[PDB]
Design a protein around this ligand. Structure first.
Ligand SMILES: [Mg+2]
Length: 438
DNA sequence: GGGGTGTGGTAGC
DNA sequence: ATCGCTACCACACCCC
């Protein structure tokens, strides 16, 4: 056990935090793409008619945690057993669940206690540990297979287990759904072989958003082909409102109230006006949804296809620790902040940049929230506070940055014993050139 | 027209 | 027990 005031707390928390792994893997995938392609030209022109194949593993962690499970779990059955991947027993997040578990209405993000109660008696939840290193290797095999197929002109990494693959269709070639079925089946078979038993599903379409929706419809272990020319009431009636990219619980709730609680995108599609959309959720998001309900991508989402190198270039660097934060005094907070900056400055040296603006964010116990929340070591119910600060000369100097961060903490006025979470950000990054003379 | 800030939402498992 | 990260866009409100 390593507590927030121990020197090794940052290292142990990140080794254990799957959310860190997700983010660290994404970042490495993004930088890897930029490296492979520094000399190649990674763009899709407006000259190109293209097909989008949106690929991702079916219940990634659960699948892989099963396939590499320890001897204690040799007899458990991925097709009959409700399986979750989690650290703990009570208020531990279900990082991933197989589709047997979902049949009982369980979803990721749910706590293990909550999911235990949606099972009939006698049916027992299986809880698998995380296998991070195997998660990596299976992902490597995933992207290695996608490249070896030589059927894609651009392979965009979305996630450790998710990629958007772009096929350019010359106008001499007449695309057909038969040929698209055969590609999906090739891809699915080849990743099944290359990953020793992991299955992917594929959405296939002539827009990013319809490929995202097709993919939801393809799950589990299948594929779906739906171009703009194939749209139908049957299609839209199949999706919830928060199946739309950009629509999370907050946008959902706003949409639900403005539009008489639509229960499908088909419901949404018939009742909506562009301006009532914009009014309900916002101008840019409203437009994105409007375009989306026609099967069309917006200008912001098309950028990744036109200039992936710019969209995938890292613009900020940060850490976030909102679990395990329990400090008795201001000295321990300052030393933790210093470990934080030291960590971020290593990462910042790796990418050979300086930073010219930094931010500190914190979570403070709500005045009426219990000192110890339901989730062990959780941040609990919190107000957030943020404050940023421009540096004069861009820099990678620990002395300047750690001093300013501690100053920022101090302007925020949060007693060490009320602290429940900390973020440390480098907001603007500046390249280091061969010229360094003033 | 151009800056700026802090805040809030969303995405992957 | 339990590991509630992190990048990025958008917005609302401020300034000369
Ligand atoms: Mg959604």
């Amino acid at each position: 056990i390593v507590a927030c005031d121990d020197p090794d707390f940052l290292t142990s928390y990140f080794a254990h935090s799957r959310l860190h792994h997700l983010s660290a893997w994404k970042a490495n995938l993004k930088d890897k793409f930029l490296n492979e392609n520094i000399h190649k030209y990674t763009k899709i022109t407006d000259k190109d008619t293209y097909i989008i194949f949106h690929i991702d593993f079916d219940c990634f962690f659960a699948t892989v945690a099963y396939l590499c499970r320890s001897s204690s779990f040799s007899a458990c059955d991925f097709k009959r057993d409700p399986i979750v991947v989690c650290h703990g027993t009570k208020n531990s997040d279900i990082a991933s669940c197989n589709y047997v578990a979902r049949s009982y209405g369980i979803k990721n993000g749910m706590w293990v206690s909550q999911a235990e109660k949606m099972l009939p008696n006698g049916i027992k939840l299986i809880s698998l540990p995380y296998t991070f290193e195997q998660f990596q290797l299976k992902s490597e095999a995933f992207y290695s297979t996608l490249k070896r197929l030589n059927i894609f002109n651009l392979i965009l990494p979305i996630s450790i287990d998710e990629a958007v693959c772009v096929r350019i269709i010359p106008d001499n070639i007449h695309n057909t759904n038969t040929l698209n079925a055969r590609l999906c089946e090739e891809i699915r078979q080849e990743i099944f072989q290359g990953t020793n038993g992991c299955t992917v599903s594929i959405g296939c379409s002539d827009s990013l958003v319809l490929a995202r929706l097709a993919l939801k419809m393809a799950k589990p272990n299948g594929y779906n082909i739906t171009f703009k020319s194939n749209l139908s009431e049957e299609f839209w009636s199949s999706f919830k409102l928060d199946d739309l990219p950009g629509v999370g619980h907050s946008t959902l709730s706003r949409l639900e109230s403005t539009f008489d609680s639509p229960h499908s995108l088909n419901d949404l599609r018939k009742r909506y006006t562009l301006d009532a959309l914009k009014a309900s959720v916002g101008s840019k998001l409203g437009m994105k949804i409007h375009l989306a309900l026609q099967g069309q991508d917006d200008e912001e989402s098309l950028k990744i296809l036109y200039d992936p190198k710019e969209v995938l270039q890292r613009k900020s660097l940060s850490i976030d620790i909102n679990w395990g934060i329990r400090f008795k005094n201001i000295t321990q907070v300052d030393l933790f902040i210093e470990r934080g900056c030291q960590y971020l400055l290593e990462k910042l040296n790796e990418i050979n940049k300086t930073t010219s603006q930094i931010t500190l964010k914190l979570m403070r116990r709500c005045k009426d929230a219990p000192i110890e929340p339901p989730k062990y070591m959780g941040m609990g119910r919190c107000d957030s506070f943020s404050r940023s600060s421009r540096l004069g000369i861009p820099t990678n100097e620990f002395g300047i940055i750690a001093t300013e961060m501690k100053s920022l903490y101090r302007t925020l006025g949060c007693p060490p014993m009320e602290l429940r979470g900390l973020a440390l950000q480098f907001n603007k990054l500046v390249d280091v050139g061969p010229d360094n003379n003033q």
